[PDB]
Structure 1
Amino acid sequence: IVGEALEYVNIGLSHFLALPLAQRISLIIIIPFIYNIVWQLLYSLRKDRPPLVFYWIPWVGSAVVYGMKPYEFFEECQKKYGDIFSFVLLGRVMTVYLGPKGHEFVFNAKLADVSAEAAYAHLTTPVFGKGVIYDCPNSRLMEQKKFVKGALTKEAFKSYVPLIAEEVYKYFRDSKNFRLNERTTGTIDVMVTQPEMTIFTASRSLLGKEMRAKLDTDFAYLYSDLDKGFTPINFVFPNLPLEHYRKRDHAQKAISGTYMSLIKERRKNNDIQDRDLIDSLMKNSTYKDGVKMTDQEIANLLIGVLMGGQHTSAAISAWILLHLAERPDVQQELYEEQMRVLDGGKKELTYDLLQEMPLLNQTIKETLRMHHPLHSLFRKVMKDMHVPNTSYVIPAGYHVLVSPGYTHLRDEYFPNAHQFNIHRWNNDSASSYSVGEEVDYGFGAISKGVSSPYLPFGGGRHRCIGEHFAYCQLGVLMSIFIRTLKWHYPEGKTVPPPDFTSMVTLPTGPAKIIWEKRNPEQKIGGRH
């Protein structure tokens, strides 16, 4: 008889509940540890699942090693398992597909298979505001991107270039980090200067003179507050009721309120031209179904676009300065190009002349290769996905992770990948180009194939639309840097390792360089 055994289950249960709370919590801690270990061993026996990276701590998973050094994590996993593997990340299962076929599998995934907004809305929506980017169906995002692109034309860039140039010179003249009329040499932290230069140039051109003017006041602190809400922390804790979450929410309201004030002021004055992105969205933000974006949604879209372009661009210009700091040969080569294209500096820089500066553009291109701002891009898996030429199935509820920035740094696709070499792009200085067929998801024709090992701007429906603005901004900025200054490292200093813990792969600061005026007695005009 096992009825007696059934009695002892009950008895055993009663004795369990009567254990000392020392052993009890000890069991509360050890019982999931064992189950988690057991479950993994069972999981590895499945062959319709990609290999899963082993981990000791339940829920946490490989979060530590991935959070701190994701490319080293990927390389070890790649050696062990190949290009497709999964790992647990703070409650989630992430399936990584490394390499060009991984680019295809994720970036060109069917709309019904994966969702970007399901992965990102929790973070971005509190920062940008409601109704836009990832707080809306994909079809709305497609048209929002179309609206923004309408202010990102060649004719717009022709107008932006002198505005951006003005801001760079103003910064050289007025910022305490330079003061070129008073000082001929100095030391700067590029992680201090580049965010400032980036927001000043982007505000002036995209938002206009009024909004740029606000950055000279205490209002600028709000952008810094809003900046704090844009952090990997908010992927896990999007809202816990403490301080920087409040200042974030406050900043969003305060900043969007300022934009709406200008929007409403321009319309009631009929003061709507073709100056900036605000004018453009005011004249062009009606969806195809006839629903118009509200002034709040327009304001929120402005925040998201400026914020995203802020962090990517500021990281890159910082990396460009840092790589050139130990390459006076490259500075010299870029300077000669400036002298030739701008006729010894007597030609005023224009958007057209920027396109005649291949080495400068190649420098941006090579920096984008070595320092892709976003080391990982996510999608939540919505339907079971079969991985082609495998028996692998990625079940709904998983997340897929694609990492073009990892491939950027592989010798197989870029010889001597860890060497900064702008000449690997000789006769290939364009920001990007489709090697064949195109397709339109609602914001213009783009590459249908996403198999390039070089994808600084992603691909597919979620592809970047700011690439030409970024090159314009970076180009003007670096053209002026090169013509005005020489710079180098403090003794014993070199290019710093990336900080993979922030939203973008910015350099580990403080990252200091020493600048010197090429023309010590050159003065920058204007009142101050």
Structure 2
Amino acid sequence: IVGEALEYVNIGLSHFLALPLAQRISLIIIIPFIYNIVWQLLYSLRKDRPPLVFYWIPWVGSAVVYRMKPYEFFEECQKKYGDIFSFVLLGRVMTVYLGPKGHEFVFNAKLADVSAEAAYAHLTTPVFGKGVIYDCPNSRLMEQKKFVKGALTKEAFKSYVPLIAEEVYKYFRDSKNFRLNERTTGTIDVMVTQPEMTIFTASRSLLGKEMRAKLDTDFAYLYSDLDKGFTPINFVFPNLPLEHYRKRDHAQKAISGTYMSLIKERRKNNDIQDRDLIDSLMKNSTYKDGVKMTDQEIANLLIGVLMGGQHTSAATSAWILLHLAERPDVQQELYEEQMRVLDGGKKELTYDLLQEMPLLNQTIKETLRMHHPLHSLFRKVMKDMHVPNTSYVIPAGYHVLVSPGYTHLRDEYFPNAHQFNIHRWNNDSASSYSVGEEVDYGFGAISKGVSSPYLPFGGGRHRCIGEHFAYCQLGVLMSIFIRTLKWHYPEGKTVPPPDFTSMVTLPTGPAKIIWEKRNPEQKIGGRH
């Protein structure tokens, strides 16, 4: 008689529901904790699954150590498991593929295999607005990148350089962090100055003088509000009844409203020329099926492009300053190149002369090697993927994680990878370059292979299109910094460690440097 056994099942069930509040809620804790550890041991038996990093807390997973020290977490998992391993992250299963072959597996994955918008829609749509970037089919994103790229030509860069130069000098003249007509030395926090110089130069060139003029008013507070809304918490809590989320959404409406106001006003006057990205998108935002971007979608695309380039570039110029602060030899070498190329300062900086400054461009290139602003890039796996030359299968619902910034710091591909050395790029100052064949995904021909160990701007269909703008912006800025100032650390201070917890791997602040004028008597003209 096993009939008695099922009776005692039912009996035991009723006795379970009659356990005290103390013991019951403890079982709601211990029974998933126990089952968590059982499932993992059964999981490590599957040979079609990459090894899974062990974790105690269910759902949370390895979130704590990945959030704080991802590159150290990756190297430990690489020593233990190899280049392909999975780990649980806040309810998601992340499959990491390290190395150049990991770059190929993710950046060159089939459009039907992975989705970037499935991974990033919650991070960006609340900040940027609806209809653009990752709130649309990939084919729409491909053409949006094509639209933006139309205002990112060599002709545009020739006009942006004197505009960006004016903004840098205006900042040297007017900002409390410098005031070079009143002070010959001072101390700045680079995480204060660089975001400000980044938005001032990006707005003036990409958005135009009207939008730049707004930043001198209370309107600049909205950018700060919207900027605060670009944060990793959106991956878990995209919308919560809080003040942070309200000022963010308010900023998005208010900022996009200002852009639409200018857009509708220019078309109201046929004041549509070739000045900025706004003119460009007004003349060139019709998809190939005939659908035209709305004024709201155009404005939202402006926010996303400007916000993305804001964080990557501001972090990068901060890192450049921090590495040069302890390298007066490099500052000295960069200065000589400035005197040679610009004829002792008698030549005005142009976009063509920027291209004749290899050491300056190598400095940017080396900084982007040691400080990739995006330490990890994600895709959600849409169809079950097989890893070549393995038996591994990444089932749909998993996420893949590619990390070129980790390969940037491996000695095998960059000897003495943790040494800052711009001369490792001698006779190779190009921001990046295709090492052979090419492919066009809808926004221009780009490298077909994505196997380079150096991928600061990614690769494949989601490859960056701001690379040449960033080098232009960083180049003009650093050319002026070099010619105007020397700088160094306060005694005992050095390059800070990266903050991997923010949206980009910016330096841990406050990161202070002491500037001093190369020409104490030099004055910056203009009224103020």
* Both proteins in one fold, TM over 0.5: yes
Quote the residue 2:169 is aligned against. 169
Cα deviation 1:308-343 (Å, max 9, x = unaligned): 000000000000000000000000000000000000
- DSSP 3-state at the match of 2:345: coil
Matched, 1:457 2:457: yes
Q: Normalised by the size of structure 1, how large is the TM-score?
A: 1.00
Q: Distance in 1 between matches of 2:172 and 2:70?
A: 36
1:393-404 equivalence runs, <5 A: 393-404=393-404
State the shift of 1:229 in Å. Answer: 1.0
Matched, 1:471 2:452: no
Cα deviation 1:231-252 (Å, max 9, x = unaligned): 0001100011111100000000
State the shift of 1:123 in Å. Answer: 1.2
Flag structure 2 segments of 5+ consecutive residues without an equivalent.
none
State the shift of 1:68 in Å. Answer: 0.3
Quote the residue 1:342 is aligned against. 342
State the shift of 1:175 in Å. Answer: 0.0
State the shift of 1:280 in Å. Answer: 0.2
Quote the residue 1:512 is aligned against. 512
Q: Distance in 1 between matches of 2:120 and 2:214?
A: 30
Q: Distance in 2 between matches of 1:264 and 1:41?
A: 61
Quote the residue 1:239 is aligned against. 239
Cα deviation 1:145-170 (Å, max 9, x = unaligned): 00000000000000000000000000
State the shift of 1:480 in Å. Answer: 0.1
Flag structure 1 segments of 5+ consecutive residues without an equivalent.
none
Quote the residue 1:418 is aligned against. 418
State the shift of 1:73 in Å. Answer: 0.2
Quote the residue 1:282 is aligned against. 282
Q: Distance in 1 between matches of 2:282 and 2:241?
A: 35
Cα deviation 1:434-482 (Å, max 9, x = unaligned): 0000000000000000000000000000000000000000000000000
Quote the residue 2:126 is aligned against. 126
Q: Distance in 1 between matches of 2:229 and 2:392?
A: 37
Q: Distance in 2 between matches of 1:183 and 1:137?
A: 52
Cα deviation 1:340-367 (Å, max 9, x = unaligned): 0000000000000000000000000000
Q: Distance in 2 between matches of 1:360 and 1:497?
A: 23
Q: Distance in 1 between matches of 2:7 and 2:292?
A: 69
Q: Distance in 1 between matches of 2:235 and 2:39?
A: 26
- DSSP 3-state at the match of 2:380: strand
Q: Distance in 2 between matches of 1:232 and 1:138?
A: 23
Range 239-248 or range 396-405, more displaced? 239-248
- DSSP 3-state at the match of 2:344: coil
Q: Distance in 1 between matches of 2:519 and 2:147?
A: 43
Q: Distance in 1 between matches of 2:26 and 2:273?
A: 69
State the shift of 1:394 in Å. Answer: 0.2
- DSSP 3-state at the match of 1:522: coil
State the shift of 1:130 in Å. Answer: 0.4
- DSSP 3-state at the match of 2:85: strand
Cα deviation 1:105-145 (Å, max 9, x = unaligned): 00000000000000000110010000000000000000000
Cα deviation 1:30-77 (Å, max 9, x = unaligned): 000000000000000000000000000000000000000000000000
Quote the residue 1:385 is aligned against. 385
State the shift of 1:2 in Å. Answer: 0.9
Q: Distance in 2 between matches of 1:129 and 1:63?
A: 28
State the shift of 1:406 in Å. Answer: 0.1
Q: Distance in 1 between matches of 2:227 and 2:241?
A: 17
State the shift of 1:228 in Å. Answer: 1.1
Q: Distance in 1 between matches of 2:63 and 2:123?
A: 18
Percent identity, aligned pairs only, is 100
State the shift of 1:258 in Å. Answer: 0.1
Q: Distance in 2 between matches of 1:149 and 1:505?
A: 26
Cα deviation 1:84-118 (Å, max 9, x = unaligned): 00000000000000000000000000000000000
Q: Distance in 1 between matches of 2:28 and 2:449?
A: 50
Q: Distance in 1 between matches of 2:336 and 2:184?
A: 22
Q: Distance in 1 between matches of 2:496 and 2:208?
A: 35
State the shift of 1:390 in Å. Answer: 0.2
Q: Distance in 2 between matches of 1:283 and 1:433?
A: 30
Q: Distance in 2 between matches of 1:38 and 1:125?
A: 38
- DSSP 3-state at the match of 2:200: helix
Quote the residue 2:51 is aligned against. 51
Cα deviation 1:206-226 (Å, max 9, x = unaligned): 000000000000000000000
Q: Distance in 2 between matches of 1:350 and 1:495?
A: 31
Q: Distance in 2 between matches of 1:177 and 1:523?
A: 16
Q: Distance in 2 between matches of 1:457 and 1:267?
A: 35
Q: Distance in 1 between matches of 2:173 and 2:240?
A: 42
Q: Distance in 1 between matches of 2:301 and 2:126?
A: 12
Q: Normalised by the size of structure 2, how large is the TM-score?
A: 1.00
State the shift of 1:81 in Å. Answer: 0.2
- DSSP 3-state at the match of 1:506: coil
- DSSP 3-state at the match of 1:86: strand
State the shift of 1:272 in Å. Answer: 0.4
- DSSP 3-state at the match of 2:439: strand
- DSSP 3-state at the match of 1:507: coil
Quote the residue 2:22 is aligned against. 22
Q: Distance in 2 between matches of 1:294 and 1:84?
A: 43
- DSSP 3-state at the match of 1:501: coil
Cα deviation 1:455-513 (Å, max 9, x = unaligned): 00000000000000000000000000000000000000000000000000000000000
Q: Distance in 1 between matches of 2:407 and 2:363?
A: 19
Range 2-11 or range 62-71, more displaced? 2-11
